[PDB]
Design a protein around this ligand. Structure first.
Ligand SMILES: C[S@@](=O)CC[C@H](N)C(=O)O
Ligand SMILES: C[S@@](=O)CC[C@H](N)C(=O)O
Lengths: 163, 160
């Protein structure tokens, strides 16, 4: 995908997220549709979704794709690395990468943007592509701005679903 | 009509995934992924959880969808209100239907109950007409049963 079109796709992506979340704070509906949205803008996406922090590790959250890894310990895997340092992590080639937890998929490249609030790790937004070297700094800046529109629009509260 | 083995392989696959895993989020999320990958005509496969007064979009597989469904509204509100699995053979000639995907032609919603409480519903949309019959209701209610006994409805570990 051309750089100018990637840039454009991301501009409509982040705007649409703002339009979608306008007036909606539910973390469940937001996290869910967010993954649906990303998946609809990037065809190479083989996985788009979240992994939330259960307090001790990362457990699978709303996502788009095939059956995936359930839990992930910090430091381990691309997602584990990201959650640890709390910084985006990109992987050009996943087949020659050393710390990559392969939960199937035809993922050749992957990126993980950490979600943070009040110095606390809420979890991570992760995307896998069917193409090698498919994520760069452009993807990094827009996905972080995405996560930012997400958290800014979402009240991290699961209260309403208990009992 | 061997839609049974398909569903057997599916439900056996399900128990295996929840084997030693009770997190509501991890479980509901993979359940939608599992259904989706196992049934080709699936346009939407996911859940709508009850927030106290209405249905609210939860872990699903599909395009961007409706966020909240009032009880009694649409096929999801129906299934929720009557706490009984509902089936629609032709989504277009069904009056009380809520469209969130233009490619959906038939739909089946199966309620999720626990201790006389509505937890939510499992909603499946197909791109084919009358693609769901009594066989789907049996096997999907069998899916939900297994899902609800191996899953602890607890979000507390994500709060704060
Ligand atoms: C859904 S599945 O792709 C997840 C985890 C990830 N690739 C890892 O190295 O952490
Ligand atoms: C996600 S979508 O298929 C929603 C709706 C449902 N068919 C309606 O009658 O409730």
């Amino acid at each position: 995908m051309l750089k100018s079109e990637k840039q454009s796709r991301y501009q409509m992506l982040n705007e649409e997220l703002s339009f979608l979340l306008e007036g909606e704070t539910n973390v469940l509906a937001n996290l869910s549709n967010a993954s649906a949205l990303i998946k609809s803008r990037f065809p190479n996406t083989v996985f788009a979704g979240f992994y939330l922090f259960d307090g001790k590790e990362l457990v699978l959250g709303p996502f788009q794709g095939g059956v995936s890894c359930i839990r992930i310990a910090l430091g381990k895997g691309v997602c584990g690395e990201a959650a640890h340092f709390q910084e985006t992590v990109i992987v050009g080639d996943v087949t020659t990468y050393l710390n990559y937890i392969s939960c199937d998929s035809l993922a050749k490249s992957e990126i993980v943007v950490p979600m943070m609030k009040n110095g606390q790790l809420l979890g991570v937004l992760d995307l896998d592509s069917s193409e090698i070297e498919d994520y760069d700094a452009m993807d990094r800046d827009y996905l972080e701005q995405f996560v930012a529109i997400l958290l800014e629009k979402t009240t991290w509260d699961f209260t309403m679903f208990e009992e």
